[PDB]
Write a protein that binds this ligand. Structure first.
Ligand SMILES: C=C(Br)CCC(=O)Nc1ncnc2[nH]c(C)c(C)c12
Ligand SMILES: [Cl-]
Length: 167
């Protein structure tokens, strides 16, 4: 039993809800919140901009030190950093950004990072300003993640479309 509430069960291990991941994280304080990161950990907009703003820019300060030490992530890769006031940990995961021309096949590699964590609160990777089809992202999630994933979908219209079309 965990503290996640109001989710629709899609499969044995994948759940979905119309929710703002920022507000959901603040309420649940999950062990792991997933950020929709870029390789530079520049948290300017989309989910990343919202998560960072909620940390009062502490996420960005920590991230800049991480990049100064380690260099950029790989597309499809991840790193574990602090969850600040939102979660114990933040798993920064880089899905391909279609608006940059990145290979959509890397979306599966991106979701594989979730399997290193028993339970996660997450957005759909590569959705939103990353330009991928969210229906495809949900399919890859379900077919790749084996650990327990709680998906927060901000847009109510998109959430209903994702549910109604789920096979
Ligand atoms: C937004 C659209 Br159109 C479709 C993608 C989507 O639902 N992305 C998200 N999913 C969950 N929490 C979220 N918080 C914020 C700020 C975003 C962007 C977000
Ligand atoms: Cl985004």
């Amino acid at each position: 039993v965990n503290s996640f509430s109001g989710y629709l069960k899609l499969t044995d291990n994948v759940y979905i809800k119309n929710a703002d991941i920022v507000e959901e994280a603040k309420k649940v304080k999950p062990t792991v919140v997933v950020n929709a990161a870029n390789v530079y950990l520049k948290h300017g907009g989309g989910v990343a901009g919202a998560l960072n703003k909620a940390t009062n820019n502490a996420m960005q300060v920590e991230s800049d030190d991480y990049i100064a030490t380690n260099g950029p992530l790989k597309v499809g890769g991840s790193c574990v950093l602090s969850g600040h006031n939102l979660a114990k940990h933040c798993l920064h995961v880089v899905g391909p950004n279609v608006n940059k021309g990145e290979d959509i096949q890397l979306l599966k590699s991106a979701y594989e990072n979730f399997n290193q964590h028993e339970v996660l609160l997450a957005p759909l990777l590569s959705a939103g300003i990353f330009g991928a089809d969210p229906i495809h992202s949900l399919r890859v999630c379900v077919d790749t993640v084996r650990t327990n994933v709680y998906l927060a979908v901000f847009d109510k219209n998109l959430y209903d479309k994702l549910v109604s079309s789920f096979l």
